[model samples]
Target chain A: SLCGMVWEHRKGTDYHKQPWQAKISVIRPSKGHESCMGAVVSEYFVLTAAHCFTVDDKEHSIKVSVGGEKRDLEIEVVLFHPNYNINGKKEAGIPEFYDYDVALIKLKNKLKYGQTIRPICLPCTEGTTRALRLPPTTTCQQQKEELLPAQDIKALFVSEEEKKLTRKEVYIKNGDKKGSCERDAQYAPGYDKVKDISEVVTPRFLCTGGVSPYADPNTCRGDSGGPLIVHKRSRFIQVGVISWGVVDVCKVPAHARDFHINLFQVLPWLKEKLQDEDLGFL
Target chain B: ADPDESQSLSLCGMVKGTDYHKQPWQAKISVIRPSKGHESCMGAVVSEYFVLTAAHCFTVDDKEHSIKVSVGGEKRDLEIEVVLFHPNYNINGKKEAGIPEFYDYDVALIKLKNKLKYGQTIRPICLPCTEGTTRALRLPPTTTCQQQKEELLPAQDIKALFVSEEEKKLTRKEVYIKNGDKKGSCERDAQYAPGYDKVKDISEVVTPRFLCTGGVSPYADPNTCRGDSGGPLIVHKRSRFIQVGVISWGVVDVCKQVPAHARDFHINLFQVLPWLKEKLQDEDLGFL
Candidate 1:
């Protein structure tokens, strides 16, 4: 069902398939330039892992490639999520911070897709809600038992089934610590101490983890800025963006247990942006 | 047509239509650590099955130590069982110093257990061709052929020129610049040579499928640098990008009067596309 939602969003109305797609090309600032990964979100915007933006403010430079196969892209603009805070601490007593993990790049020119490139669609406001409620068990089971290799536990989260579980089930306990609530208490204890506690939990944001003694399926380091989709009635919705997680305890996984900025919370803000003629979202 | 003189040009000298000079993002290669080893801090997708990377990236002691690969946008990660190193890689060499004799053979190929998922983000870059046909040249011309062989070699051999000659000559021909001579002048003279030496000796020549770039400063900006070693030196032809040179070696130290450094050569990927395709068996990713 979640897959169906994703398929619908990918092919839905109001979302145009552009000939040109936007991609975030992650590269090392130094001579050993290698592409880390390419962001595949919108034609004019790229979605990438938050860590890509963590390099020294002075030394690190990331370039966005757009305009299709011509390869004549520009590199002057980098718009990190306004809430991203790279220095905040993690939920499981880890040293890292719960930075705002998402970013976007506005391409100089609209992309033109040929055979090699095309644009992916963004979920509509209603589609976002649908994605949040989808089931995860079937997708997880299929990925683990059928499609993926046995050794790839990391991929467990990537499967349509596992993704379903992620949306529906909230592991009140931490799995990394053998599901101990005491450990969760020792680490997060409660949500009172969370930084930017109020500003971070607006309607556009959803708080998922806190001081649970055991580890839960909270967001981790590699999961930053990843979409938190919901699956309901076999339809998937893009509900939130992975943002921060709890920190400060041995029982929890470092940077494990994430928080997301709720799509609903930011619908008004996005609508305002979409309404702006300059952004071209309309 | 002469690669030696062409290799000496600066990055600026190359035009978008003549050589692959598109933005770096036109072709992307993802580098993933083997599923078993330490998680890869370096994450990249593959541009081609035979990828150009730092020779040091591979472990000389054990071929299996090499990592696996996932082609295209497949969410699945695949394993690479065999890794072929350029026979000419020198074990001992520094980023700076004299141009090593083995600089040419700095490239290598990873044999995947399964075919790649050909789609966006995972495909082969175009290789330059002599005729109208778009296939990869199995055995390239002497100069270009040697250059491609060097790409499959190790970094140590590519950096060999920096080491003293008593050490094992990774390849047949050693192009070490003599002492008391300026590098720029040596490169200029070497560039003018009609037919350059392929390998110093027979034992050094492993495969005839290679090429070489003899001239110094092929472009205004000498192509290879410290970090550029083992990377792709591409030229954009028409609408496609071709691998003209593998980042082999560069002038290590300053030459007395010449404004050049001794650089090593490697086989261009364009020359070896046929072999790679035979091994890969799938051209969807390459041709698309």
Candidate 2:
């Protein structure tokens, strides 16, 4: 809602000017489906959904690409958070906790840096974010001494077919409303396996997508584990990583609400992973 | 299934006809998944003990024991005992920068639990009984291409049957017999595809281990997409399907953008036979 300046369609959109968009790409392990979408945070590092990986997903099968249209890079290492779990809490059918749904990918080769394949600026207290973040938060609605602005998060997407399917940015106001997201998680139906608990959404997530009266559009299909970016003037900062969505986001527009992991809250853990590989101190 | 000239010849078609699940259909192709009853990938039954596929299919925990093969068409499902990927074949090879890492030697051998008994529907495809068989294969032509004695195209257009997902399901048996091309001819057609690096010859792209086909019609500029990987690129020799290639990779919009010159590549079994034979320990491979 905030960073999404306009309603960019999702059909044959171009990303040549949107280099930050280039920071994001798809993770296709095998033939059938896309494991999840991911983003380039550093030359050798990638941020993505933890669920995209299986215990077996490794150097051989998991393929990732950025900047280039074709897939050429292979992830040498897949580090899913030790606590990341798909159905975090399935006890007595009372579902809760989609906590720790993030992962770090180490590439076999450093990706080529260019106008097309660039990394997104990450939100951090670290003063130097990027050239894009060098500008301050200003608005047409602002007075000289008026307050700055609330953060705006925009999602980047790629489909299972590996098509760059975003015509317009799927913008939402970084609906990191955990309380509202939890209320939305209750009552999954039809599957007896989940019938007892009928619960899914958890507090560890941020919410997006909703009904038409508010004119909100939900996650289509391949936006899973997609990047939710916060725009700071010229720079785009990734603030959340998509985790789970209402299974029927496609069927019931009414239930289109999707959830993502709060990155700002989990920065410490993410930096810990980078620190282990001697790639970061932040 | 013993190799015999029992069936007669025809141009091309799918066997939705009666007994479709019998004979050649039953054993040749397989639907593979990482564990039982899940989304699938393609695997071809090569020997009684081995099925062939792309090395790109499995992951670390996703090993031979992690996969199951659904063969016999709709007739039966068989569990796989093991899966062995090629030693040099790395889908994600860390080749030196600037050196193109061709999808060459992109092959895998899958082992089944027991020897499969062939019936009319179940059998091993002929992989050139001898190098002599390889030379003779080029003589055949498609519905449109007439055989011009001297104009033997290095590649041949063929029908490849793979599982289709109407709902875009993870997995199909069906025939794509035409809208194909020959190797050298299709290679030259690359100008029609996106990213046709003139600096790189089609030979550089295709390499010696791969064969080229597709680049004709229906979609105008023909090509295979993601799910079609690992299906058979076969020829109807003496009426039985002799697999000459293994369905592999392609460059542009796999299927979405079909620009004519963009050809599909297959693993050249003729070149790969030595390796296949070495990796395969079963007694029946000579039969293939």
Candidate 3:
């Protein structure tokens, strides 16, 4: 549980500390600006969205500032999903698709865990199962089913403006509600005439926005790669990675929802990338 | 004779009147980047081809193709053809010797590439002293500039729209302002602009062209900041939204939290009516 535990000494009613938060910035050669958020998963690994960086961006162009770190650290390596298709089916009229929008960032140096600098537990992993007090025999599927059974999951993210932890209710928008994600995705440009959303959004993606059930505040542009986490068993476990959204929430907060890549679907990819002995991947 | 029925079908300044959700004339101006466009400032739709906002919202590097406007609930990608910053808009004029800059004529008119088709959620807001606004406010055609200023000045219940800092979304709040010289109001607190070191008097910077609001002397009011600039300062008359001011400048640039004695200054439309009329006439948007 210590892996995902918030600082206990400062635990109070207003203890909104996020020791696992990581801010990533990319200085492109073309003078393009690409900033995103991430979650520190280990001493040398960080989890974020794959779309934050382009193939042309070199490793030296990336920098990460973890929670409580004095200076932004340079990157050692970047690993995006091989199946991540940035330009998805231009001929089929679907312009963009974020099915496998997940990446792992390898830090140049190991991070020192402190009161304000720690790692967040990745769901469906051995570390997360132990944090939840599950038996040693518990399967990854069982852990996932237990973690996300409810129609609505309580969640939170770091608001980029004030760097404050903002609470939100992530209502499951897939399968349960007919055509929820499909109708919402049309609000995004170029997807207006999308008749079938399954082509763009696969089962690996989790939709967590809309006005129905709970009117949650959607994520903004810079929050694209941040973690969408849930507090359970006195520990925070990331359930999804911020991917894309229908409308720009900065312009129109209402009538829009966000789409996050379900971490459970990409658990194998994460475990493969984070093979360091200290990470304890199941 | 039937004012009620005719007013319902008025061409401009119309709204859905649905719990402040539908603002027909609200505009969001943004700078287009490589991947996405970020909302830089707010604007007001004046006609099919023009938008009005603050000149300070743009910079020298902002080219025509780099600007985009999203109006009301329309999904159209409104492109900018021309960005006309007022010729007299000088943040640091010759008179601003040792003091902070002054936003004398901080207004800009954006000409869109395509002519917009007005609809339920894509209409225009009434501009001050225009034929549409004159009918909406029930003012006579013979109303002089001074008379209009007298009528609109000392307005205490004007509504201003700005992008919320916390939520990063468009939001509206009630603001109270009055004549600059009013006791316990603008004049007393206008001198608190943070960097005005050499200003011995308030009149040197806060002039007649600016309408003032907010300060601790009277009662602290809601303040606008950088992202909120170029938004519309509106007055609702006869169930229509008439824009009488533009969100120009404030004492400081704090958007996260408002200071104790924050004084906000807006460009008074009546004082610069000549400039607006001339430009609007050139664009064929002038009214009788």
DockQ of all models, two decimals each = 0.02, 0.09, 0.03
Looking at model 1, give its docking quality level: incorrect
Candidate 1 chain A, run of 10 with poorest lDDT = A151-160
Instruction: Give the Cα lDDT of each candidate.
Output: 0.35, 0.49, 0.68
Question: What is candidate 1's DockQ?
Answer: 0.02
User: Residues B200-233, candidate 3, lDDT per residue (tens digit)?
Assistant: 7777677777776665535556777556678888
User: Which is the winner by DockQ between candidate 1 and candidate 2?
Assistant: 2
lDDT digits (tens) for residues A1-282 of candidate 3: 267788766563222377888887764211223678898889898899987874233334466787645587867888888788856665566655677889888888888877677889887677788889889888877887777773566666665655455545566654565267545665654555667777766788777777666777777777778888878889888888988776655544444767788888887788788876355666
lDDT for residue A77 in candidate 3, whole number 0-100:
82
Instruction: Provide TM-scores for the models.
Output: 0.33, 0.52, 0.53
Candidate 3 residue A4 Cα shift, in angstroms, is: 1.6
TM-score of chain B of 3: 0.81
Candidate 3: list runs displaced more than 4 Å.
Answer: A11-16, A28-32, A54-60, A248-254, B1-288
Tens digits of per-residue lDDT, candidate 1, B88-179, equal 55533321222112233455665555654333234344333322113233333433433433432322212111111112111112232221
Q: Whose TM-score is higher: candidate 1's or candidate 3's?
A: 3
lDDT of 1 at B194: 12
lDDT of 2 by residue, A1-282 (tens): 112122243533344434334332332312343445677767787788776654243533355666546665766877777877544454444222356778888887876656455665554423223233333443213311111123233443333334444532444433343344345444222112443222454345566555422435554445556667554454455667876655433324555555677666576777776664333224
